[PDB]
């Protein structure tokens, strides 16, 4: 009776589609005749953070907007001062294959994970001044692609074994495990309120989950290929995704449907990192064409190009202050742009 | 502002100590040579890494071993702790010197999957610059499978009917011209992929490896040597 179930699912998804078409009374770009284009944006590399031997695969900013963690594939987790270009820390990792790094909102801890298939947490504010790993989270069975601290005790971890998880660091066990995805969830983003989070997977679907109740609130499927990069809009209502389709997509949770498609004919490489500026008017997108782009998120136009890297842009972040944007890349340097 | 100046001086001291440690680590990093080992359940890549290993126990996802030949460090990653999809974690290995590719050469039905994996690795936009040291494994078992009959390699590969042996080594594969005609047919099947693309950026280095072979460390050595040589000769563009 699997065919009856398939047609039942097709009926309910056509109900979802008709609800989305009822939402789609007018497209966003039609309403925005009266908005002023941003026009011209150029951003210059204020600091070239050079200290990494291998390709930089992740970065995370600080909440102080100055102390950023970065992760490269030689085995170094380097915490940099973005202001004075000083390497305040450089941890040797146990396994060099890390694909994500996290910086705690308090700034007390950092985290890492990847092909070691373990989320390690390192205590920055140690008593002795020598940073040590606090605990390892060893419950995932794929790889690790994104981790974010909710606080100094709760951490949510995306993975290659199709499941996100949320962990108690002091306990060491998964407080919950989000097991709705079909394949290889690659990036997760936290809402401002940290009550619900979004995550895109290689099943071309970006899904909204509730933190406390451990279930998938909503599912979005507009992309055609693997999703590599997700971030909420700064208010928490919308979120944009960067997929291997070579297009970015802006979905809104309250409408359950995509709003914008940021793409162009002359871009045929997958977005590897995405980010929203503090206003959300700028959507910043790493790329495999060796250069970042910056988009106006409200008209789907290229506001500007951030071309400074010899290799693909593997990571991309913006400060909570909104002054800087750091782009790491596979050419082993970060660059900070205003 | 005086304690502010002390804070900046302590920051500069931290940066100097960190960068000295990073030079100390960069030397070892460039001294070692990374090798992504790839294979399948059929392919005896665990046996191959065992000959470079033997001649503590941990389940931390992926095997990651060390061997050394003529004072050169070789650091070889068996990624055996992930799912059977590999199109995202293979991007982490765009900077490895040589991808090892171990293939069970006896099982002809698995070989189309092996060549499909090889063709994916060859044409991947991040692995298009990494040379592959193909290790066609289990030649002593392929000899049994071809000399025993009752396994129709022509029915597994129809191109084998119209194939002739180009070249051979005399003592070790040259006992029988049938199994030899088998084994190079497998080899050329991968080489037809390797020469189909890649403008001098990467090369296949196929080796006929038995179940036991103590020389695979030296084969990886002498092929990584040619790989480094060929890229040094490729910044010159004498082509």
């Amino acid at each position, epitope marked *: 009776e699997l065919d009856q179930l398939r047609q039942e699912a097709e009926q309910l998804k056509n109900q979802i589609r008709d609800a989305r078409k009822a939402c789609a009374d007018a497209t966003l770009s039609q309403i925005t005749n009266n908005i002023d284009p941003v026009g011209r944006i150029q951003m210059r590399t204020r600091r070239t953070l050079r200290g990494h031997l291998a390709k930089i695969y992740a970065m995370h900013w600080g909440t102080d907007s100055r102390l950023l963690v970065s992760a490269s594939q030689d085995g170094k987790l380097i915490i940099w001062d973005s202001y004075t270009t000083n390497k305040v820390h450089a941890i040797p990792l146990r396994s060099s294959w890390v694909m994500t790094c996290a910086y705690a909102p308090s700034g007390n801890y950092v985290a890492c994970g990847g092909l070691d298939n373990i989320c390690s947490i390192y205590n920055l504010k140690t008593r002795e001044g020598n940073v040590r790993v606090s605990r390892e989270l060893a419950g995932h069975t794929g790889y690790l692609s994104c981790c974010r601290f909710l606080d100094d005790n709760q951490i949510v971890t995306s993975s290659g074994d199709t499941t996100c998880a949320l962990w108690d660091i002091e306990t060491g066990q998964q407080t919950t495990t989000f097991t709705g995805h079909t*394949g290889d969830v690659m990036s997760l983003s936290l809402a401002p309120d940290t009550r619900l989070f979004v995550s895109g997977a*290689c099943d*071309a679907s970006a899904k909204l989950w509730d933190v406390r109740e451990g279930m998938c609130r909503q599912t979005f499927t507009g992309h055609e*290929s693997d999703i590599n990069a997700i971030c909420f809009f700064p208010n928490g209502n919308a979120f944009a995704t960067g997929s291997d389709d070579a297009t970015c997509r802006l979905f809104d949770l309250r409408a359950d449907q995509e709003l914008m498609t940021y793409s162009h004919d002359n871009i045929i490489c997958g977005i590897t990192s995405v980010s929203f500026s503090k206003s959300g008017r700028l959507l910043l997108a790493g790329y495999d064409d060796f250069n970042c782009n910056v988009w106006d998120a409200l008209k789907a136009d290229r506001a500007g190009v951030l071309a400074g890297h010899d290799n693909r842009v593997s990571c991309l972040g913006v400060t909570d202050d909104g002054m800087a944007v750091a782009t790491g890349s596979w050419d082993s340097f970060l660059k900070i742009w205003n | 502002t005086e304690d502010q100046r002390n804070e900046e001086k302590a920051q500069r001291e931290a940066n100097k100590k960190i960068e000295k440690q990073l030079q100390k680590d960069k030397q070892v990093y460039r001294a070692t040579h990374r090798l992504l080992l790839l294979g399948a359940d059929n392919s005896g890549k665990s046996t191959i890494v065992k000959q470079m290993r033997i001649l503590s126990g941990g389940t931390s996802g992926i095997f990651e071993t060390k061997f050394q030949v003529d004072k050169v460090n070789f650091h070889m990653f068996d990624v055996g702790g992930q799912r*059977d*999809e590999r199109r995202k974690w293979i991007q982490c290995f765009n900077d490895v010197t040589a991808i090892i590719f171990v293939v069970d050469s006896s099982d002809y039905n698995r070989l189309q999957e092996a060549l499909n994996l090889f063709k994916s*690795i*060859w044409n991947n*936009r991040w692995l298009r610059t990494i040379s592959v040291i193909l290790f066609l494994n289990k030649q002593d078992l392929l000899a049994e499978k071809v000399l025993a009959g009752k396994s129709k390699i022509e029915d597994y590969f129809p191109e084998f009917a119209r194939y002739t042996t180009p070249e051979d080594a005399t003592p070790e594969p040259g006992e029988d011209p049938r199994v030899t005609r088998a084994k190079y047919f497998i080899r050329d099947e991968f080489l037809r992929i390797s020469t189909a693309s890649g403008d001098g950026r990467h090369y296949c280095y196929p080796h006929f490896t038995c179940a036991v072979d103590t020389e695979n460390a030296r084969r990886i050595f002498n092929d990584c040597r040619d790989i480094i040589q060929r890229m040094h000769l490729r910044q010159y563009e004498l082509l």
Partner: nanobody, 126 residues
Framework: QVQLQESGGGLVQPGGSLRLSCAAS????????MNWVRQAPGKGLEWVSD????????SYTGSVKGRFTISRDNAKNTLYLQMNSLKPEDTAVYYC?????????????????????RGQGTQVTV
């Protein structure tokens, strides 16, 4: 959403003829390399054929090289497997698998797990 539905099949005596058609919606069909993958009962999955973006580059596995023929039309978003001179070794579920990315010649589509852009399925029995 992305869908890949297969039409055709049923039961055919050995030596017959058949033609599977995949209607694939949810993407630009031309920009991707399409594949036909089978699953014989009591086995895993194993790739059968593939066709490039424009249809120029074509390949089949070492069993169905002369018999079957892959084809595609991109203005109809359809991928055909013309099956001729069928065999009892050809009884399998047939999925039109898609390569995971556009504009690339690398594909990872045989996976024993639930690959995302594989089709739903079709019993073809001989």
């Amino acid at each position: 959403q992305v869908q890949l539905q297969e039409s055709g099949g049923g039961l055919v005596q050995p030596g017959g003829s058949l033609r599977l058609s995949c209607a694939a919606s949810g993407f630009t069909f031309s920009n991707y390399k399409m594949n036909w993958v089978r699953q014989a009962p009591g086995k895993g999955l194993e790739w059968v054929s593939d066709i490039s973006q424009s249809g120029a580059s074509i390949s089949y596995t070492g069993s169905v090289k002369g018999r079957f023929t892959i084809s595609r039309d991109n203005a109809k978003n359809t991928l055909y497997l013309q099956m001729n001179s069928l065999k009892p070794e050809d009884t399998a579920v047939y999925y039109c698998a898609r390569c995971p990315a556009p504009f690339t010649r690398d594909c990872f589509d045989v996976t024993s797990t639930t690959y995302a852009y594989r089709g739903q399925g079709t019993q073809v029995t001989v």
